[PDB]
Design a protein around this ligand. Structure first.
Ligand SMILES: O=[N+]([O-])c1ccc(O[C@@H]2O[C@H](CO)[C@@H](O)[C@H](O)[C@@H]2O)cc1
Length: 153
């Protein structure tokens, strides 16, 4: 059928809920910065992997690329930003996000918020993005609600 997916991105908090159950939550004050990634099985919605890449810091984007490249094309892929995910989100990682169909990922900027749900090998199911209005500010919280189709048989 479908999965009811909720993805929240903000300065101080991320969460992901699937069918009304929270599968990822991070509101720890000075922890969990960067891009949180959840991978779901495309038939059951079970969580196959959960990661966080602190892409405000060097080398985390490289780890993110190596991880995403191992994710199977049929998987549901969910990304959400806590605090800052762009400073060291460099060209190879942005090109990979573009190849998934993400519009905001390849454009991600300083303290922007971003929530994404898509099938790894395409298409994107939902995406939201808020641009930070000033270097001293963060993007607005975004809460993406998306009905994700499930595979069967
Ligand atoms: O002047 N600057 O280049 C500059 C000024 C203030 C900055 O604050 C930091 O920003 C990070 C990303 O949001 C936060 O993780 C961190 O806790 C702190 O708030 C960073 C850079």
């Amino acid at each position: 059928r479908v999965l009811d997916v909720e993805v929240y991105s903000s300065r101080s908090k991320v969460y992901v809920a699937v069918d009304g159950t929270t599968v990822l939550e991070d509101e720890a004050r000075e922890q969990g910065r960067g891009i949180h990634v959840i991978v779901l099985n495309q038939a059951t919605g079970h969580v196959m992997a959960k990661r966080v890449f602190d892409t405000y810091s060097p080398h985390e984007d490289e780890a993110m690329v190596l991880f995403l490249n191992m994710v199977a094309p049929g998987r549901v892929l969910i990304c959400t930003v806590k605090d800052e995910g762009s400073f060291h989100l460099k060209d190879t990682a942005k090109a990979l996000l573009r190849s998934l169909g993400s519009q905001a990922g390849p454009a991600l900027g300083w303290r922007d918020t971003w929530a994404f749900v898509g099938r790894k090998g395409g298409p994107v199911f939902g995406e939201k993005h808020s641009k930070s209005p000033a270097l001293s500010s963060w993007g607005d919280p975004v809460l993406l609600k998306t009905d994700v189709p499930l595979s069967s048989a």
